[PDB]
Amino acid sequence: GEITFDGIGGLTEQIRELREVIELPLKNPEIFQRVGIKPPKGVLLYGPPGTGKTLLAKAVAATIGANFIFSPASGIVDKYIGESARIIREMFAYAKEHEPCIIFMDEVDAIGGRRFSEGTSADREIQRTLMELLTQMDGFDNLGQTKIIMATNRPDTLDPALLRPGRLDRKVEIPLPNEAGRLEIFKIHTAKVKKTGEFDFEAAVKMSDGFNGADIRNCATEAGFFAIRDDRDHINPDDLMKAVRKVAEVKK
Amino acid sequence: ADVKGVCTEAGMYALRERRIHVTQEDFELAVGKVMNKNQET
Amino acid sequence: RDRRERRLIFGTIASKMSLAPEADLDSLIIRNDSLSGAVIAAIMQEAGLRAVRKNRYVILQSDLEEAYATQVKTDNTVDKFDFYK
Amino acid sequence: GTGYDLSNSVFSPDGRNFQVEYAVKAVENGTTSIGIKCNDGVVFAVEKLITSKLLVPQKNVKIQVVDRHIGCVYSGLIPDGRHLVNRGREEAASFKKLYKTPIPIPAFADRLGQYVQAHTLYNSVRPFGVSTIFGGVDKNGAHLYMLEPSGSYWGYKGAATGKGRQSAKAELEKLVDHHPEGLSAREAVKQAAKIIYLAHEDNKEKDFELEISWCSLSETNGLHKFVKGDLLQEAIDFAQKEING
Amino acid sequence: AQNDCNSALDQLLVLEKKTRQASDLASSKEVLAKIVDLLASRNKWDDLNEQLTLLSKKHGQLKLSIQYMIQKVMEYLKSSKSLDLNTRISVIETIRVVTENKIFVEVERARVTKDLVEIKKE
Amino acid sequence: MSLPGSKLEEARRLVNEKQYNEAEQVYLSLLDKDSSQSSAAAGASVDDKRRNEQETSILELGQLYVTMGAKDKLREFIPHSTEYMMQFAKSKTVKVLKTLIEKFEQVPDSLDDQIFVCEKSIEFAKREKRVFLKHSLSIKLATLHYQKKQYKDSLALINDLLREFKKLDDKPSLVDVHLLESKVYHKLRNLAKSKASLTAARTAANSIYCPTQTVAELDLMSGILHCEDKDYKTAFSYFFESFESYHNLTTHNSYEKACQVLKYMLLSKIML
Amino acid sequence: AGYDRHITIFSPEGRLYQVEYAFKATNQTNINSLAVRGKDCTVVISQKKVPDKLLDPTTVSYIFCISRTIGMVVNGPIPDARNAALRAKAEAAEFRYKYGYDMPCDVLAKRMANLSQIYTQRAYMRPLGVILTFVSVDEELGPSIYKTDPAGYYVGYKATATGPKQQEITTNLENHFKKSKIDHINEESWEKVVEFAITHMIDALGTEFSKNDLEVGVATKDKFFTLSAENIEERLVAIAEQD
Amino acid sequence: DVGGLDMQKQEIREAVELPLVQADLYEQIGIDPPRGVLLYGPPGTGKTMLVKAVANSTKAAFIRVNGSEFVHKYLGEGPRMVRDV
Amino acid sequence: MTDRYSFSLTTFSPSGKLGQIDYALTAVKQGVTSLGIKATNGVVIATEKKSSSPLAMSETLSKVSLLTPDIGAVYSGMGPDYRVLVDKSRKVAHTSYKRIYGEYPPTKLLVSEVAKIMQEATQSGGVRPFGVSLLIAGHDEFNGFSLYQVDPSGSYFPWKATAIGKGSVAAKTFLEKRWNDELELEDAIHIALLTLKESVEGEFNGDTIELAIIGDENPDLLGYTGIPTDKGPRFRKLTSQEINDRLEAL
């Protein structure tokens, strides 16, 4: 990835859970085998995207060395005989050869919806992609060292079948950071920005409520725009106090 | 439509028990199943 | 599903992993009322994982309960039921 | 649309109806008022915009009294603001007769509070388009409260509402923290004038007249007065030394 | 007498607080070993044994350090003999590193359990 | 001492330490004594929370009575204690009355004695206008008559019961009487009549929930008929189901029952 | 009629949109709350978040003292919380004069419930979304915890929690109660109850609290008080030296 | 591999196994065999596993046919994939 | 400035149906099981007490209310509607038949006041029907023992047994078969408990079960053992312990 897990600390609980579900089965299968339970095989991310969600997905790939494989959902529909089928299959096929590898499927709502008014406009192509996906899980194609992560904004068009384990076991949410989490995420984001020698993270942390990681990064950058204005490289606690209250005003 | 169901359900009981000629015993047992299905909802 | 049908499904998924002497099956049957085999399978598999990460060989009655509570949790709402309020 | 843009008679999933959202906006298109709490008092200040040369000073002031010790200043729509204080005055007067006491500031806040809440549970009675900052000195100490279109109120150490609300609060939390609370009532008037100045940059297309008032225990002796004369001129002058925008 | 009992308790609370649930070392595992060794010298075996278990209901610093301390105490017991072999049965039955995974890849967990097999044979 | 809790406790150990007879004096003392709340149930003391405890002394005593050959004292004791309960709360009288017919038959009894209690119980039910409980007591009679081999007498009684369930209360009872009917006919060596009686049980069983055991008794009969009309192969797979059901039941199916089924699974294979 | 998106009536699904949305936003104050009963006492521990440093904390309360003995925790938005507080306090005061007797938790509960159900029918007036937790230490039944919801529903509790981390708190409470098999904490002295409560809170929302982050109110025989900052600090301190 | 499915198991058995094994006896009775079976509900719950278990047990071939990958986008391959299968 | 609204919230539809009333018929269906059996020798009403948090209690909830001493009532539908209606119903019964009379109200006559209230709320806008249907079970000396049903419209009918709540038709059908002619009150309790067992699953306890009879009035139910001066309750709730005995006895 492009970021590490110290680069996005203050999502802690979600960090700790993802660590244990993806890294750990690679490092020891052995513990899960002695017990005799199967290994974890699926992870789901939901939350609005690029608030911390996208960040997590990259950060996990980095530490394992895992190859991130991005699928665009509207590359998996192309208008010729048998191409849609081939892309999903080929992609999984190669993940098993070169495993460990992450298949990050963005928007499995275009590629594994379940209609709402039962049309097949281009929504049979939706069935084709979903079907292929189930076949590989349900079959004798073996994922365990090969990892699949789906991402979808809101969970509303995933069949009960996926929610059964051995498909998706682990379903990770996005909540809004602790007080303790705000302090941690502020520390990292104003660390990497230049500053006056005296600084107060804590001050900002109280005023902020209803922010997510992307909102806390913006506050770091907001303070800095006024520092370019003020003809310097140095945020002050004084920029930050303004920055945080403005981001706060523009929303709930 | 139900009468038709009864006759084939009866046949499946004889068939399992490895006989090709059906009885009153099979016909009652089959009816009792079909009756329960109409009692639902 | 009825109480006798449910009992098999809990038994069967548990056969494949470790089992406890301290377990009681009897609790598992009350705690899920009339919930399809798709749903019951779902809880038991999750629970078997949660334990191994918690560093345990054996699958105690407490590990099973926590997995049931995680999977049923989807209420971000404060108060539930409008069926009779 | 959701039908709750014109109904107060039903519950909305934003926790509040869109027509209450529309009143909040109207507050933001008025012209800046602040409130400064002190260690002996409270200070009120207001921006009044001058557009035309025909206006007369301090008769079109948006600062209104209730009783003789309670200061009320608001931002947003003029008719809603006058209606509001006019109700507060009746209820205050009722209090004064009935309990033979001057009103408490936390009591006055409720008295307004229930009247402002009542017209958000009723569709037939229009929300207020003002946010009113009020307070004084009483027999419990000095108190600064600020009341919103919602019926929301809380106790403050400094408070602001109007166009320059963000800018103003930023300067204010800094000063109120750097001091114990904005020192004494005299000091606060110079600071207040500086805020009204900085705030004018958010409005710098039309001119202003700075209009300040106080009710301070130790420097007005329990009564509400406007701050004027020698002292008001002095404060503009002090501002123009330091800020020179 | 009392002075050693306090030294074990007072230093334990400070040790768990120094370690936290964040790091392996921050404890000096010297203090843990020092405490345990002081206790064996201090009092009779039934007392030592009771204390070592009571401490383990906490976090116990690490699963590997507990196992190290258990295994030292176990050798002193087998050495002392008579009615003390019987008391080892109690100690081995309370602990849950020899009967449930906590990081069971150690040679030592298994080894204490082998001794319990030898006591049972006799 | 002079305490209900202490004297229950003392009495329970007292059988073992010394004898049943020393324990029996305690047990009667409890009936006879200990003032509790509300109306009596021994006539000299008042009882309700004591009378509840007295039922557990009654079962323990009743165990010993069948070995002692106080079976005859038991036979008298059960009808007599109906009216004890009759005086206070109604709800207690129902529960205790059904439980007691079961307590006697729980342990090995003389048949003549067992019958005499069942008939009087039905009489106590008649005084009132309950018929819920009373359809149930008649099942117990049928079963006892059959074992005694007064097969005609079972046949007559079962017929009347059959007509009641197909226009009145207790749907689950029906299943039990069809199975019993089969046992009456099978033994008389009338293969036809039992085989149709068994179809009726199967039909009934699947309509409604029935207890694990009640079904499991049905497969035992299904296995029996497939040995008398041959094809043991199919008879084994039935004994296999019955044997599994009895296993999960644990000791809540009888030692001797469990045994006969294991015997029949082994036996079936030798014939095959 | 022909309208249900401008006025309030029965749904044919049967789940009334206005009641459901009222179930949902209440959480717009950043609160989480619980109340438990001790053998002799009833303690409430409640979160506080201060969003400015132009704000004093000591005028920020979600517990309103109805009478002298009765407490009420409102979880909701504060203009609606207060509206209910004003109404509840007078009805309580009116009852006390008329009937010579201090208002029951359940009766206050019931009366505000029946009124909200009236406003739910009303086509010109909306229902308050407030969730009201009435507590006291009655001497005619002991400690009592009774919770209403805006619907008109109310039911008796063993202890209760509200906020989105309702489930997490629930589990902490269920575990304790299964173990003791009792529906109360039997700890003599209120103090030990407040501390326990505080532990379970720290577990559920998974953060350490400060004096200015909790507000604690305790109900005692024949008197109700909110606890101060300095006292709140004593509680947090004392649990740091159990391990 | 999956238990508690007694009712669906019995169903499947009589549907699927029996006409292949014992073709003669349907025609001898003079009543129709079953020929098509529909499994409805979510797959991969233990559903697919019964299908697969019978297929091995009877020593029949398992042919897994993707219905939705007929969904080809012309007159070419798809309608002929059906002939051959 | 408000309270000028009176346009109806219950209108005719083109099938001449009533909109609110269709909606409310569902509400009853989404309820829990409640039944009534008139044995002639009394009346037994039973319901499931169920609750909406595990931390709540259903032992400290009630779904049978006393309307007047000798009469108790139960419902299926929505909790809020039931509480306000019971209060208004308790008010009119005291005011109009114990200040104008002194004998406690005959049953049917009390049903007519509950019916009038519910229909009144359907006619008039700014209120909507109550979303509930009652079985009001009572005793009166000149009627004997009685059972009435009140429908959500405000309509009434007598029944000698009926059932409401989930699987309404099927519960009622079960009663027809198991009970014929006249049988005992005692016996009818045994039956009522079984009937309630078959509707429900996952709760079987007597702390979630409430069964009450109208069938006797004792000095013990009078609150004094002196010489009577009023009739007093004929309503009696059977104990959780009492319920538990009888489940074993099925």
UniProtKB/Swiss-Prot annotation, chain B:
Disulfide bonds: none annotated. N-acetylated by NAT1. It is found in: Cytoplasm; Nucleus. Present with 4700 molecules/cell in log phase SD medium. May form a homodimer or a heterodimer with a related family member. Interacts with OLA1, TMA17, and UBR1. Belongs to the AAA ATPase family. The 26S proteasome is involved in the ATP-dependent degradation of ubiquitinated proteins. The regulatory (or ATPase) complex confers ATP dependency and substrate specificity to the 26S complex. This is 26S proteasome regulatory subunit 8 homolog. The lineage of its organism: Eukaryota, Fungi, Dikarya, Ascomycota, Saccharomycotina. The gene is RPT6. The chain holds residues 356 to 396 of 405 of the full protein.
From Swiss-Prot, chain F:
The keyword Acetylation applies. It comes from the Eukaryota. The modification N-acetylserine is found at residue 2. One of its GO terms (cellular component) is proteasome storage granule. Keywords: Acetylation, Proteasome. Changing residue 132 to L: In rpn6-2; temperature-sensitive mutant that shows defects in proteasome assembly when incubated at 37 degrees Celsius. The keyword Transcription regulation does not apply. N-acetylated by NAT1. One of its GO terms (molecular function) is structural molecule activity. GO terms for biological process: proteasome assembly; proteasome-mediated ubiquitin-dependent protein catabolic process; ubiquitin-dependent protein catabolic process. Belongs to the proteasome subunit S9 family. Component of the lid subcomplex of the 26S proteasome, a multiprotein complex involved in the ATP-dependent degradation of ubiquitinated proteins. In the complex, RPN6 is required for proteasome assembly. Present with 16800 molecules/cell in log phase SD medium. Component of the lid subcomplex of the 19S proteasome regulatory particle complex (also named PA700 complex). The 26S proteasome consists of a 20S proteasome core and two 19S regulatory subunits. This is 26S proteasome regulatory subunit RPN6. It comes from Saccharomyces cerevisiae (strain ATCC 204508 / S288c) (Baker's yeast).
Curated annotation (Swiss-Prot), chain H:
The gene is RPT3. ATP binds at residues 41-48. This is 26S proteasome regulatory subunit 6B homolog. The lineage of its organism: Eukaryota, Fungi, Dikarya, Ascomycota, Saccharomycotina. It comes from the Eukaryota. The 26S proteasome is involved in the ATP-dependent degradation of ubiquitinated proteins. The regulatory (or ATPase) complex confers ATP dependency and substrate specificity to the 26S complex. It is found in: Cytoplasm; Nucleus. Belongs to the AAA ATPase family. N-acetylated by NAT3.
From Swiss-Prot, chain I:
It comes from the Eukaryota. Its main location: cytoplasm. SUPFAM superfamilies: N-terminal nucleophile aminohydrolases (Ntn hydrolases). Pfam families: Proteasome, Proteasome_A_N. There is a cross-link at residue 108 (Glycyl lysine isopeptide (Lys-Gly) (interchain with G-Cter in ubiquitin)). The keyword Hydrolase does not apply. One of its GO terms (cellular component) is proteasome storage granule. It is found in: Cytoplasm; Nucleus. GO terms for biological process: proteasomal ubiquitin-independent protein catabolic process; proteasome-mediated ubiquitin-dependent protein catabolic process. Keywords: Cytoplasm, Isopeptide bond, Nucleus, Proteasome, Ubl conjugation. InterPro entries: Ntn_hydrolases_N, Proteasome_alpha, Proteasome_alpha-type, Proteasome_asu_N, Proteasome_sua/b. Belongs to the peptidase T1A family. The 26S proteasome consists of a 20S proteasome core and two 19S regulatory subunits. The 20S proteasome core is composed of 28 subunits that are arranged in four stacked rings, resulting in a barrel-shaped structure. The two end rings are each formed by seven alpha subunits, and the two central rings are each formed by seven beta subunits. The catalytic chamber with the active sites is on the inside of the barrel. Present with 7060 molecules/cell in log phase SD medium. This is Proteasome subunit alpha type-2. It comes from Saccharomyces cerevisiae (strain ATCC 204508 / S288c).
